[PDB]
Design a protein around this ligand. Structure first.
Ligand SMILES: Nc1nc2c(ncn2[C@@H]2O[C@H](CO)[C@@H](OP(=O)(O)O)[C@H]2O)c(=O)[nH]1
Length: 105
C-alpha cells in the first residue's frame, strides 16, 4: 500500500487514485459536473502524460473521501475520455495558480 503518488506531504495509494478517477469519469461520461468538476485540463504546464488527451481534472482528496462538492483542495487527478490515468498534480508548492507534478517514479 505504497504511495502511488505523493502530493506535497499527502500520500495517495493506488486505490485512492482509482476512486477519484472513477468518480470524475462517471460524471464526465454522464455529461455532468459538481461544482465545476471535472473540467478540461489544458496542460499549459507541459507535463509528460503517459496517455493522450484531451485531459480532464477532478479533485483527489487529502482525507481519502471522493469529491462530491465543496472545496477542492489542491490536488487533482488527470484522466482522458477513455478512463485512462494520466497522473496526479498539485497546486502545493506551485507559485500562484500553476501546478507541479506529484512525486512517483
Ligand atoms: N495551471 C493550469 N490551470 C488550468 C489548466 N487548464 C485549466 N486550468 C484552470 O485554471 C485553474 C488551474 O490552475 C484551474 O482550476 P483548478 O484549481 O480547478 O485546477 C482551472 O480552472 C492548465 O493546464 N493548467
Amino acid at each position: 500500500e505504497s504511495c502511488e503518488y505523493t502530493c506535497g506531504s499527502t500520500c495517495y495509494w493506488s486505490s485512492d487514485v482509482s476512486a477519484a478517477k472513477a468518480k470524475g469519469y462517471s460524471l464526465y461520461e454522464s455529461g455532468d459536473t459538481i461544482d465545476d468538476y471535472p473540467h478540461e485540463y489544458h496542460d499549459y504546464e507541459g507535463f509528460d502524460f503517459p496517455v493522450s488527451g484531451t485531459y480532464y481534472e477532478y479533485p483527489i482528496m487529502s482525507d481519502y473521501d471522493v469529491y462530491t462538492g465543496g472545496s477542492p483542495g489542491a490536488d487533482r487527478v488527470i484522466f482522458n475520455g477513455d478512463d485512462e490515468l494520466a497522473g496526479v498534480i498539485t497546486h502545493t508548492g506551485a507559485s500562484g495558480d500553476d501546478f507541479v507534478a506529484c512525486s512517483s517514479s
